[PDB]
Structure formats: C-alpha cells, structure tokens
Design an enzyme around this catalytic site. Structure first.
Site, short mmCIF file in Angstrom:
data_model
loop_
_atom_site.label_atom_id
_atom_site.label_comp_id
_atom_site.label_asym_id
_atom_site.label_seq_id
_atom_site.Cartn_x
_atom_site.Cartn_y
_atom_site.Cartn_z
N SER A 166 1.01 -0.88 -0.19
CA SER A 166 0.07 -0.16 0.15
C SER A 166 1.06 1.03 -0.06
O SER A 166 1.67 1.18 0.43
CB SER A 166 -0.94 0.18 1.35
OG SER A 166 -2.12 1.15 1.71
N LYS A 192 -0.86 -0.66 -4.66
CA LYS A 192 -1.88 -0.56 -4.26
C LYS A 192 -1.49 0.88 -4.20
O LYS A 192 -0.48 1.43 -3.52
CB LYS A 192 -2.42 -1.16 -3.40
CG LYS A 192 -3.76 -0.02 -2.21
CD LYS A 192 -4.79 -0.61 -1.46
CE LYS A 192 -4.52 0.14 -0.29
NZ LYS A 192 -5.44 -0.87 1.07
N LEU A 193 -2.21 2.03 -4.98
CA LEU A 193 -2.00 3.53 -4.84
C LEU A 193 -3.20 3.91 -3.91
O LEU A 193 -4.26 4.12 -4.39
CB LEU A 193 -1.66 4.81 -6.02
CG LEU A 193 -0.64 3.31 -6.32
CD1 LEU A 193 -0.68 5.15 -8.15
CD2 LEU A 193 0.43 3.94 -5.89
N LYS A 194 -2.50 5.25 -2.39
CA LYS A 194 -3.71 5.99 -1.84
C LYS A 194 -4.03 7.31 -2.80
O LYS A 194 -2.87 7.85 -3.66
CB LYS A 194 -3.51 5.93 -0.83
CG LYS A 194 -3.26 5.59 -0.02
CD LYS A 194 -4.39 4.35 -0.32
CE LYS A 194 -5.19 3.66 1.05
NZ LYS A 194 -4.35 3.25 2.19
N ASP A 202 -6.75 3.15 -3.70
CA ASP A 202 -7.53 3.52 -2.52
C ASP A 202 -7.76 4.95 -2.59
O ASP A 202 -6.79 5.21 -2.07
CB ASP A 202 -6.91 2.59 -1.77
CG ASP A 202 -7.87 2.41 -0.35
OD1 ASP A 202 -8.94 3.12 -0.47
OD2 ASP A 202 -7.46 1.89 0.64
N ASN A 233 -10.70 5.52 0.55
CA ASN A 233 -10.59 6.05 2.08
C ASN A 233 -12.16 7.16 1.85
O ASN A 233 -11.99 7.53 2.77
CB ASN A 233 -9.75 5.94 2.49
CG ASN A 233 -8.71 4.31 3.04
OD1 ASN A 233 -7.59 4.64 2.25
ND2 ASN A 233 -9.41 3.72 3.72
N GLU A 241 -10.92 0.98 -4.55
CA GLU A 241 -11.06 0.85 -3.62
C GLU A 241 -12.00 1.75 -2.73
O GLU A 241 -11.41 2.57 -2.99
CB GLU A 241 -10.46 0.42 -2.17
CG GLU A 241 -9.95 -0.61 -1.43
CD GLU A 241 -8.81 -0.68 -0.63
OE1 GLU A 241 -7.36 -0.20 -1.36
OE2 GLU A 241 -8.74 -1.18 0.21
N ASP A 244 -14.31 -1.74 0.87
CA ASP A 244 -13.81 -2.00 2.33
C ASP A 244 -14.56 -1.32 3.53
O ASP A 244 -15.06 -2.42 4.16
CB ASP A 244 -12.57 -1.39 2.24
CG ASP A 244 -11.20 -1.14 3.57
OD1 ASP A 244 -11.90 -1.47 4.83
OD2 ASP A 244 -10.82 -0.46 4.15
N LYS A 293 -10.71 -7.21 5.65
CA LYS A 293 -10.44 -6.59 7.01
C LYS A 293 -10.58 -6.66 8.26
O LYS A 293 -12.17 -7.15 8.63
CB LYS A 293 -10.52 -5.63 6.87
CG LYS A 293 -8.83 -4.71 7.28
CD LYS A 293 -9.06 -3.04 6.13
CE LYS A 293 -8.37 -2.84 5.35
NZ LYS A 293 -8.11 -1.11 5.61
N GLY A 309 -5.22 -4.72 5.64
CA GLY A 309 -4.20 -4.47 6.33
C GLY A 309 -4.65 -3.40 7.57
O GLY A 309 -5.14 -2.39 6.28
N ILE A 314 -1.87 -1.80 8.80
CA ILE A 314 -0.78 -1.43 9.14
C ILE A 314 -0.48 -1.95 11.00
O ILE A 314 -0.12 -1.17 11.65
CB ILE A 314 -0.70 0.12 9.63
CG1 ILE A 314 -0.83 0.42 8.69
CG2 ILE A 314 1.09 0.00 10.01
CD1 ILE A 314 -1.02 2.06 8.95
#
Ligand SMILES: O=C(O)CCC(=O)c1ccccc1C(=O)O
Ligand SMILES: O=C(O)CCC(=O)c1ccccc1C(=O)O
Ligand SMILES: O=C(O)CCC(=O)c1ccccc1C(=O)O
Ligand SMILES: O=C(O)CCC(=O)c1ccccc1C(=O)O
Ligand SMILES: [Mg+2]
Ligand SMILES: [Mg+2]
Ligand SMILES: [Mg+2]
Ligand SMILES: [Mg+2]
Lengths: 367, 368, 367, 368
Positions: free
Chosen positions: C135, C161-163, C189, C191, C214, C239, C263, C291, C293
């Site tokens: 990530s 995986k790119l935020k 992702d 979020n 995501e 997610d 998760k 995950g 962290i």
C-alpha cells in the site's frame, strides 16, 4: 407578521445585448416586483415570468392577475404570516409557481429582515463566494459566438453554457471546443427544442466532453429524457421539468436526470428550492443554480442559494453587467470568477429608489 | 458567531416509572447536556445517548469523549460558526451522529436566540400544536399493560405504541385491541428484536390493524426489511436504520420502509432531521417524530420539529410527566391530546438552575 | 475455557516513513493490544483502531473504554468461553466491531494454542505462503511517488496499491503505468474521498487497467457504489462498507461490489472474516486481505487468513519492515513476493517482551 | 496428518418400521462406513447413499467404487492432509458429493480427535442441545398415520415432517391438522414428487399453515420452485437442489427457496455444510438439519451441526430408536424433545464392534 399589503410594480429593463434562446429573442426585460408590507418593514420579491408564455405557461400578465386576484388576497386574509405558511395558504390554487414563488420571496425577505438574518443563513449557506458561469445565447454566426465566448472567458468566467437549437448544435460546440480547448467547462441548453427522435443528432455531441445537456425535450417528457440518456453520452440535465422536489425525485427515480438545475421561481419559491437541493443531494444528484435574467434582487437570492453545499457546479449566477448596464441595486461584480454572498438581512440588497423609478412602468398597491 | 466554548454536564434523572424495551429495563435516565457559549449568548444541546450502547453504538461516556477531544475542539478552531457549518466542520470524524447532533443543537439554539427566532420558525413549522402519542414499555402482565394503556388513553393520548419482543407480541396486541377497541391508534416497536426468520410470527399481527411495525430487524438490515414487508401486512416503520436523509432515500427506494420515524439525534441533528423530513415528503413517505426520553430541552425541540408539514402521524412527544416528575424546564402538559409548539427564541425553553443543578452529576468547561 | 482476566496495553510504534491517506498523514502508530488470561495460557489480540475516528467512527480511546467497561466484563461473567461464544456474548452491545474483533482474537489465540491449533488450521488454509502487495501512500511529488513504487517493486512486491484523493488520481496513476508498465498489478484506494458526482473524474481512470478501485465513496453509500460501477470501467472494491458477511451479501446483491477487501477487525473478528470469505466465495466475488498497519500480531493472523482459498488477489500483507524498523514479534520477511503462513499453535507468533515493553505506554488489568 | 489408509465397511441395519417415501419403501438400511487411519488415530465417516440411485444419482456401490478407485487414493498420495485440504484434493473428480462427504467426515473426525476438539467446536456450536423433530412416512391409511404421528408427539418430538406424494397430500395433512391441532409444527416433504403443473394441488395445502414444503419438484428445477413459490402460500424448502453453498446462493437470489435444509453429505461434507449455513444466514434464510437415516455416527455430527446458530428450525435429528433398535454407538435419547450435543473430541462417539460386526457385511482396506 401580519400582511399589510403588496405593491406590484411592472419594470422594464434593457438588456446590454439581445438574448436568443430556442424560444426566441430578448432585447429588453419585463419584470414584475413585489414590495411586501408588514408592520415591521418591507420585503422584496422578484418574478421570473416573462412577457409571453414561451419558457413555460406563466407570463407577466397572468402572474399579475393571479397575484392580484387570488394569491395576495389570500395572504391578506390570514392572521399570521410566515414565509413557510405561505404555501399552505396558497395551496388551493393550482400551479402558478413563479408567482407564488415571488410572493414567498418578498414575505421571506421581510421575515428575514425582521430577525436580521440573511437569505444565506436561512438557506444554509456553507460558502461565502460562489463560482459563476455564463450562459451564452444563440448567435447568428459562429465567429460572432467565438468572440463573445472568448470575451466571457476573459472576464474571469468559470463555465460556458451555450443555448442550442436544431441547426445550432454540434457546430457551435465543435467550434468552441476547437478554439478554446477541451479544458473549458462547457454545457448546452435546448430549452425543450428537440425530440427523442433527434437522439442521433444529439448523440453527435458525445465526443465533446460537455458537462451536460440541459432540457433537450419538453417539460412533460420525463420518460423520454430517460430514454434519451440511454442513447447519448452527454449527461442529462433538467430545468423546465423540475417544478418541484417531488418532480426531481420522480425524475431521479426514473433515471431521467443526472444533474439538476435549480430555479427558485420555477419550483415556486426559495423554500422549495432548498428542498429540491436536499432531495437531490440525498440521491447523489448534483445541482446548480439556474438563472432567469434577474435584477440584483433575485440575483442576490440566487447567489445565497447557490452557496449551498450540493451546488457543485457553477451556476447561471453571472455578474450584473452581463445583462444590465444599470442594475436596480448595488451591482454584482465578478471577482476571481466568483460572486460574493450577501451578508445583510434578508436579501442583503435593496433597490436604489432613484434607479427603480426610472424603469418602473406600472404600480399597484393591494391592501 | 465564534465559539467561546462548551459546558458539558452530566445529569441523572429518575423515571417516575421504569421503562422496558427490547434492549433493557430502565429506572433512571442518564443524560449529557451542552451549554455552548458564544459572544451572542448561550445555547443548549441535549444528547440522546444513554448509559450503555444498547439502542445503538453510542453511549454517554463515549459521546462525551469525542465531543471533548474532537468535536468541540474542531468547532472552536473555526473563524466562523453556524449551525449549518457545523456538519462540514465535523465531517472528518466518522459517525458519532448523536454527539454531533447534540453539539449542533447547542450552537443552533444560541444562534436562533441571537436572531430571536424559534426553532419551529427555523425548521418551518405550519402548526402551533401537535398530537401526541405515548410509548408503552414491556409489562410483566397483560393486565398490567391493560391498565397502563388504559390510563394514558384517559390522559388524552391519541395513539398507543407498544414495546414488543419475542414473547410479547401478539398477545399483548390482542389483549389491547380486544379491550380497548379497533378505533385506537396502535403500533408496536421491536427495537431490532426480530429476524427475517421471525416473519411468520410477525405476520401474526396482521389482523390487528396496526398502524405500523417499528424496526423489527437490525439497524443494518435494510433489504431484510424490504423482504419482511413483502411477508407482512403491518407497515414497516424504521428508526434505528434511518441514520440520514440518504439512508432514508435508500430505504425508500428499496421498498424497505413505508413510514419513517424521525429522531434528530439519531440522524446527527435537527438540521439533518428536516432534510429527512423533506426527502420523505418528496417520496410520499409519512413521518413522525421519535423520542428518546429527553428532558424539556430535547422535548421542546422535538415539538417544534414535529409541527412540520409531513409529520402526519402522532409522535413520541408525550408530556413531561410521562417520564419525569420534575422536569429541568417548564414542563410540557398535554392539552386535548396535544402539546403546544414553543414560541420563544431558540428552544423556547431553558433549564431552571436550581432544578438543573440538583440533577447535575458532573460539569466541565471546554474552551480553547 | 474460563476467562481469568485481560491485560490492556497501549503501544506506540514509529513509522519508518509517514503514511498519507485521504484522511491524513501518519508518522506514528498507537495500538491497542490485549492479553487474554486463562487458567490454561494466554492469548494475544490487536485492535485496528487508531488514534482518532478518521477511517471509521472507532478510535483507540473509544475501544479501550468499551472493552474495559462493557466487553471484557461481559465475558468474564460468563461460565464457559469459546471464541465462538464471544459473539453471542457481546451481541447486546451495538457496533464496536474493531474492539470486539481484538477481543475475539485474544480469546481465539488462547483457545487454539490450547488445542495446539494454528490460526491457519482453524480458518481452513489451503496454502503455505501468500503473495504480498504493498500500500503506497499519497506522495508530495510524482517523482517521489515513482521512486517509491520503484523501490517496492524491487523488493519483490507482487502488486501495487495507490492511495488516491481528489487531486491525486489520474496523474499519479498515469505516472506509474507509464513508467512501470502495463503489466504491473495496479489498484487504487480513495478511502471514501469521492462522490457520485465525481464519477466522471474516476471514469478518467478507465484507461489504466486498474484491478480495482477501493471505496471511492462513503461507507454508507452502497447504492451509490452500484450506480458508480455503472459509470466506470474500474472494478469496484469495498472496504469500509464491508462490516459483515451480511453487508457483503447485500452489496453483492445490489451490484455494488465486484471484489471484496477483508479486514478482520473491521468485520468484528477473524471468525466473521471467514464468513465473509465464504459468502463472497459462494457469490463468485474474489476477495483479498486488507491491512491496518498492524504488528506482527495482526500480521500473523492475517497471513493465515489470507491463505484461504478465495483470497485470489494479493493482499495488504507487506513485510514487517514496510512500517516498522523493529517489530514486537519475529518479523515478517518477503521471500519471493510471498510470506509464510505461521505453523505454530494460535497465531504462531508472540511478542518479544523485551521488544513490547520497549514500545508500551500503558497497561491495565481487567479481572 | 498423513493418511495411512481407509478401511471400508458395508453395514446393514434393519429398520424398526418400514419407512415409505415418494421414491419407495424401506425396510432395511444399507450403509457404507469409513475408518480413516492416521499416525495419530482413526476417524470415522458415514455415507448417506443408499442401495439405489432414488433420492439422487448416488448409491452405495457407486460410492465404493469412486472412493476406492479415485478418492481414497487421491488423498493417500498427498503429503499433508487436512479436512480442509480434502476438497481441493478431490476437486478434479466431478460430483460424488455424498462420497467425498463421508471421506471428509472420516478425516475430520481424526483431526479433531487429534487436537482433542469436538465436531461441535470446530463448527462453532453455540448451543448444547438441539430441538428435534421427526420425519413421518407415507402410510397406507389415515388412522395408521394419525396413530403414528400421535405416537411421536407423545415421545416429545417438537415438529412433524410428513412424507407426501401425489395422492398423499392434502388429506393426510388435513387429517393431522384436524386431529392434532393447529399449534403443531407441521411440514411436508415430496422428495421431488411434484410438477409445476401440480401447483394447484399444492396450492390446496395453503390452508393448513405448514412451515414448509420440502422439494416439491425435481433437483434441477430451481426456476420451477421460484415460480411455484409465486403460486402457493406454503414456503418453499429445498433439499435435493441444495448441493452446495453456491447453489444455496443462487437459489436464494432467484427467489426459489425461503428455508434451507442442510444435508452435510448431499452438499459434500460437514465443512461445506457449514458454509451453506453461513451463506443462508447472511441472506436471512433460516436453515435446518436434514437426515439420511443415519447411525450414531452421522447422527452425532448432525447434532453438532444442528447446534449452529442459524439452525432455527428443528431438524430431522430424531433419537437413534426412531429407526434403529440397536445403534452401533451409544444411542441418542430424546430429552424434553432435544438431543444433547456431543462433548468429546471428534464425533464424540464411536461404534461398539459386536454391534458393529454383527451388522457389517463387508470390509476392505485401502492403503498406499
Ligand atoms: O440568468 C442568467 O444568467 C441566464 C438565464 C438563461 O439562460 C435563461 C433565460 C431565460 C429563460 C431560460 C433560461 C434558461 O436558463 O433556461
Ligand atoms: O421519548 C419517548 O417518548 C419514548 C422513547 C422510546 O420509546 C425509546 C426510548 C429509548 C430508546 C428507543 C426508543 C424508541 O422509541 O425506539
Ligand atoms: O497495513 C497495511 O499494509 C496498510 C493498509 C491501509 O492502506 C489502510 C489504513 C487505514 C485505513 C484503511 C486502509 C485501507 O487499506 O483502506
Ligand atoms: O434421518 C431422518 O430422520 C429421516 C430422513 C428422511 O426423511 C429421508 C430419508 C431418505 C431420503 C431422504 C429423506 C429426506 O428427508 O428427504
Ligand atoms: Mg434552461
Ligand atoms: Mg423506535
Ligand atoms: Mg481501503
Ligand atoms: Mg428431503
């Protein structure tokens, strides 16, 4: 409050330059204003109807009439008046939203002033400035259009909205896009000019990255819009069709619209317009503030309205000068392609008496 | 305005008579109150969380913390504040609707007071008095229930709502319809006590002409509610599930709801609550005002809320004395099965200090 | 079993490199760990909550309180205790999934170790190692970003995986595709950072062959996702929204998701996780491990889980060192883009006290 | 583990009373048991096939074969063996669910015994006892039936499942409702006996308040069932059709079933079964434990299974003595209508050899 009386004024204002839509040409603007009078003070209301019944069934003269004979009186007869109660009070009368809309506004402004609250506070503004776009009319020439556009873009305008018509679609667009680039925000408005049958034609715009297409089909044709949406890549935006929050929800449900233009008078009031906003938001539908070539009165209200959280697209909230050399209030002046939200009570704006009189054509007091 | 700070109080109020729902038995109310301070004046907010997390995830102690360490601070940290700006301002924090709604209430009241406007005026009241129903808990005996119900009816309440639970459904309903007749407004509230598997049981109430069934399933089960409704004649009414105007539009479109219970704190505020109202109206969904055993503060805000046009069903807006012997404000008294909408600025009501001070268990001042 | 007590520790672990999501930047990781005590042995549990309520409404302090005052005590009071029974046992308390999950975990570990069973065995592993992706956060610059992918790529990470966030979508992506190729496993992702209204922008990613997007929208907007999925090419991945197996079922049913991120803490425990897996499986929805962290504690049980049959896509099961210099357990080290499923009983890991105490801020006994 | 071999056995246990189904009358049951042998210990399996292919295309002799020649070998050649891994191992072989199920059962039992864990625990039981119903066959006459039924009722059985077939539907049902009352848990099972075209006939039971009607139509006719659901008031229950979790999902999605019957063998094993349970649960679909006239072996697994949380309906988990005079394990004894979940490791039960050898008809050892 208690309603003492209303003053109906007819007003005529000359447009800086003639405005052409699919329904016709405008060189001059004939408004209808109300001055509500309550024991405390006054409030002002502006009516979005025009001379004739070309955008919708409502026109200046029919408005005046219903206002005079039915609506106003209706308000005068009740004991307590509140903006909110206007509706329920005027509900027995079918339709005539822009007129009921007008009355509501005056009442509201007055109401808001009394409590020393701005239109923005009342409506739930979350911003202090709003990004403005501009609506460009039907040209006689592509070149003459490109100019105009280029002019507006230079003025600081954030978005370009093009009035379209069968025989003024793709080319004008192709032209603008080609000249001005893809980065500009561009949309079109047919004011009910086409038919489902025109799909292929309209489908021709696909390639142009238009944000939306506003009211291609008639007002009553919701299902048709949904069908058309299916056939074109351009997002459907409804204007005329949206006479209410219920209307918006129905359209949304039927898949007939993706983005909503909010016109306060059209929906019959700023109160109703807020609901519309709320409903759309709830369904994830973006909204934007529409315009009706108003004086700084409606303009002022619109600007407040447009600072609501779901208005995520620039509105037809242009500067004062775009239509008038001499506005009846302090003028609205673009700054950083934005317009500032009024801070004062009620509208936060009022007519300059000297100015108002000049352009007044008639006057009536209903008490 | 610009937030000066907020005072957090813990109040303990005893119930004149213990209240039983599907999630527990209660004899004392524990509340969280807010006095928000602005240059313009004070504002009062009430939180609907309760001791533990049984109706929902939120609870007093939890609400307090978040308010203290996150929400309050975030508003204080602003140059401008409006009730309307509270949301966007606290948006970074996930959930905690009840806490946020409470904080919004305080700000709003103060703001309204400053403009000398009443909540009802702000919300858009169209009526000046509202029809009140009553919420009846789970009894130990039918006879007991019958009496209680009997009495409320006598005080002039316009509809009866019955707390239900597996093993306290049909009987109690049969017994009441039976004893009091078919002309009474009757509905039940499960508080998420059943499962879809329970339909056949629930379908058992079909014959009683119940106005509605409130939250038979769990909060997250919207689809099950749509399924359930296909299975029963009683109308589905949602509470717990309606966490926002968006939740409301979603469930309606899903056919999971036919009547909505609006609970301001549950939806994050009086402002959100209005939206919910508006969203329902546009969808033809009738609404009614939910209650959370509030003091006069929340009660008053609710009364106003409940005077809004789409509230065509009596809400849980009972008189003060249904829960409390001594309210902390000017009590609310039933008049012809109605309660009068408040006229003053803001809430139109406020705490009587000695009264309040007496029920206060803790107090804290949160400033910059 | 019989619950003897629980020890609640607060740990603080510095991040190798600050982590930036759409919800913010993090340099340090405060965790909540739990040591379940049985007459038999001990159990370890880790809580995915963080300092504040940014990903979800759950936060460290919030979790501590409910554990302390409601959860832990609820179990203690019970005669017999089964990881299984934990659920039922705490059902009376609404929400608090993360918290409940850690606790279950702590119980489960004990129970397993007691039957000399591994997490993986109980969960139904079929594999012995698992492909690990990484990530990557939001960077300040593209070059920065690029180096970064570059680096992870070299370590042997199987997927990227790119935020993303509004303002950090297309480009950053255009970048890695353009620089790193089209054969890389790439996904994003957000979020919850976007709105249904931002579809067009997200549609702008259609061309990069991402495996998924995501959680483009808020946690509660399931129908929004389904709609959204109708407007973009990139596959939808949820997610935040997936809080339970039911949630999953629902989303699927509504056409709101194509691939699911599991998760364990988010759903309320490893047991529930399994269930989600199965449900997804039965509906032909591929799943992958998410995950938060974690420490080697969380990491170990996640590796186990990620060995389940339906986990058909590389999960966020990076190597210990991706976040931590020193892990409280025996670190997790990437061997050919994989990681070995633990073979011992329970988690198969334990905290190295020396290491623990080093990172512990607070402790509390609850018995 | 490492699989050492499997000893296959043929058993033949006489039935107390002949049991008639829509497929034929049974007087004696002929089973096929498995004894898996590990380093550690041994586990048992039990196959649900019967003499011939009448419930499904699987039959004892067919099973033997696949097991022997395909299955057993498959695992023997494997390094590590896990109940879990059994599936993926045997995946290359199409179908033979009941067969793979028995195998996995054997393996699982060994593994569980090794870790000293019960089936129940593995599966995640949350209960200690389960409520039991019974499956009543087609009688040649009402009184016969009426009698039998009452008998079972007396022994405490909680629910009644009647075997139906064209010409044995409404009447039987009518008679039992009539005679025994309406408060009785009653369902029917057609074992694929009807056709969509028979809907009107089946619509004829609408009036009796049956919990369910199990497998009205053929295994392959899901859509038919969904249509059928549309045409009758009795809730559809699927068995034959539910060959897997995925199958369950699909059926659900299509509206073909409301309640599911779980048969661990039919679905290919206790693990799958669990999954089906979870799938159903996530869809708000109640489930129940189905029976294949099993020994004390299958009976003990089922009972554990049936204690799973979503098993909200009584299963065909009747006491040993319903079918067998002499079970090959400590018999199962109704207690207050329930059965107690096994507590020891693995099945928490095992045969008693003379009991066993007395019934065994064959034996074969399969090794590496
Ligand atoms: O007021 C403005 O700024 C532009 C208004 C405009 O384009 C318009 C003017 C008259 C009637 C309809 C419309 C329209 O937006 O459809
Ligand atoms: O405020 C009232 O009058 C009664 C409130 C009530 O019944 C209730 C009390 C606590 C939690 C939930 C509910 C409910 O109405 O669902
Ligand atoms: O543990 C990891 O490897 C990182 C996981 C991560 O990116 C994350 C961290 C916090 C909240 C949500 C997410 C997410 O995966 O969406
Ligand atoms: O085990 C029992 O209790 C009875 C099982 C039963 O009725 C049955 C017996 C053989 C084949 C199918 C079925 C059935 O339930 O469908
Ligand atoms: Mg228009
Ligand atoms: Mg309720
Ligand atoms: Mg994520
Ligand atoms: Mg059957």
């Amino acid at each position: 409050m208690k309603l003492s009386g209303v003053e109906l004024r007819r007003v005529q204002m000359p447009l800086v330059a003639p405005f052409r839509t699919s329904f016709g040409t405008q060189s001059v603007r004939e408004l209808l204003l109300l001055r509500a009078v309550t024991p405390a003070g006054e409030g002002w209301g502006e009516c979005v109807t025009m001379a004739g019944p070309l955008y919708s069934s409502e026109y200046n003269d029919g408005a005046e009439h219903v206002l005079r004979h039915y609506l106003i009186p209706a308000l005068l007869a009740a004991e307590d008046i509140t903006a909110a109660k206007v509706t329920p009070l005027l509900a027995k009368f079918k339709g005539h939203r822009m007129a009921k809309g007008a009355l509501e506004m005056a009442v509201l402004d007055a109401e808001l002033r009394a409590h020393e609250r701005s239109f923005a506070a009342e409506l739930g503004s979350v911003r202090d400035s709003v990004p403005c776009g501009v609506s460009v009319g039907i040209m006689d020439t592509i070149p003459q259009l490109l100019d105009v556009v280029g002019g507006y873009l230079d003025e600081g305008y954030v978005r370009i909205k093009l009035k379209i018509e069968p025989g003024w679609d793709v080319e004008p667009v192709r032209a603008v896009r080609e000249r001005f680039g893809d980065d500009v925000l561009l949309q079109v408005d047919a004011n009910t000019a086409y038919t489902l049958g025109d799909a292929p034609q309209l489908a021709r715009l696909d390639p142009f990255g238009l944000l939306l297409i506003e009211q291609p089909l008639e007002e009553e044709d919701v299902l048709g819009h949904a069908e058309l949406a299916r056939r074109i890549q351009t997002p459907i935006c409804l204007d005329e069709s949206i006479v209410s929050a219920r209307a918006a929800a129905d359209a949304i449900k039927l898949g007939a619209v993706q983005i909503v233009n909010i016109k306060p008078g059209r929906v019959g009031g700023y109160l109703e317009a807020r609901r519309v906003h709320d409903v759309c938001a709830a369904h994830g539908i973006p909204v934007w503030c529409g315009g009706m070539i108003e004086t700084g009165l409606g303009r002022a209200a619109n600007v407040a309205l447009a600072s609501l959280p779901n208005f995520t697209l620039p509105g037809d909230t242009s500067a004062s000068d775009r239509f008038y050399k001499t506005d009846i209030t302090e003028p609205f002046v673009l700054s950083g392609g934005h317009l500032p939200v009024p801070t004062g009570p009620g509208l936060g704006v009022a007519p300059i008496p000297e100015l108002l009189d000049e352009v007044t054509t008639a006057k009536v007091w209903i008490g």
